[PDB]
Structure formats: structure tokens, C-alpha cells
Structure 1
């Protein structure tokens, strides 16, 4: 939702990091793209996909994930 507000400047994030090996330097380095916690930035263009497809909220992506769980089932 933040990425949609300014797609040309905000980098898309794939998911958050949770690694106990991390030190302060690594934490500070990976708190990026306006995130409050360590995070990896997305590099697969799935954000542009979901946006061009018409998805605009987090709840839509969530319901899609749940429905795909049901599809796998």
C-alpha cells in the first residue's frame, strides 16, 4: 500500500528478516525501504504484477493467499 503511493521511488520488499546471528550493523543495514525492522527488498516484479492486475490493498492479497491454500487442498 505504501509502494502504490510512490512506485517510482519506494522499493518493494519481499518479506521481513528474523535471524539471531545478526549484529547491530546488519540490523541497521537491512532496516531499509522505510521498514521498522530488517527486511529484504523484492526483486521479482510481483508488486508491479499485482498492481497492474488491480490489487490495491493488503486484504486482497491475504484473501488470495487463503484461497490458494484452499486450491492446493
Structure 2
């Protein structure tokens, strides 16, 4: 047989083993050794890939802003930060039992939240955020930029 996956290497998409699956996952970003790869094509693929990476980065940061702004307590943390702990995000796991959720509910929240050991709260308090609304605005902006 001569299966489709993967199309970048013909000799790889030839053998009737399960080596083709693992190797097709492994040689995907080895642009220099695909079939029919010139040099211009190499540079162009690298360029577009860089754009992909930038999109993922900005989308991720928007995610952090969104979850902090929605499920966190950044509005209450700025009044007294030698006190009430940072909040990263909230949990909804159907596998929990009663003392589990009774335990995880900490930091002043109303459900299973877990503490934010990331330093985003101090960063955003220093640079000049004060409320949730500003964080939401930042998240929307960064999602737009990622798009």
C-alpha cells in the first residue's frame, strides 16, 4: 500500500508498519528534508510558521487575562496583598467528593479555585491595572491581535 499520511516524505509513507505514524509525527518540522523542498520554499514556510507561533503566544496571554478577570479576585486583592491569596482559576471536576470541594474553596472565593503561583497579579498591579474591566479589555485586545 502507499498511504496518504504523510505527504512530505514519500519513502516514509510507503512501509506497512506503525513506524510511519511515529516518524510522520517526528519529521514534520524538518522542513529541510521533505520532498521537493527548494530554498525559497523553505524560507517561506519558516516565515509562516513564525506567524503561527506569535498567534499562539498572544492567544495564551489573552487566556490568562480572561480567567484572572473572570474567576479570580483581582478586585479584592489590590486592597490588601499581604493577605488574601491570588486566585488562578476555578475548577469544575465531576470526580470530586464533598470534602474535596470543601477543601479547595480558598482565597475568599465561592467554589473550587486554586491559588495563582504565577506572579501575574503583582505584574498587573504594578503596571497600572486596578479593576476587572481593564483586564477584560486587555484580553479582548490580545485575542484580536492574535487573530
Same fold (TM over 0.5): yes
Residues in 1 aligned to 2:80 and 2:89: alpha-carbon distance in whole angstroms: 19
**Partner residue in 2 for 1:20:** 94
* Offset, 1:10: 0.8
**Partner residue in 1 for 2:106:** 32
* Offset, 1:43: 0.2
Residues in 1 aligned to 2:98 and 2:125: alpha-carbon distance in whole angstroms: 34
**Partner residue in 2 for 1:3:** 77
* Offset, 1:20: 0.3
- After TM superposition, the score normalised by the length of structure 1 is 0.98
* Offset, 1:65: 0.3
- After TM superposition, the score normalised by the length of structure 2 is 0.49
Which protein shows a greater Rg? 2
Q: Which runs of 4+ in 1 moved over 3 A?
A: none
Task: Kindly report the root-mean-square deviation, in angstroms, between the aligned alpha carbons of the 2 structures.
Answer: 0.5
Structure 1: gaps (5+ residues): none
Higher relative contact order (CA 8 A, sep 6+): 1
Residues in 1 aligned to 2:108 and 2:125: alpha-carbon distance in whole angstroms: 19
**Going by fraction, where is strand more abundant, 1 or 2?**
1
Equivalences, count: 73
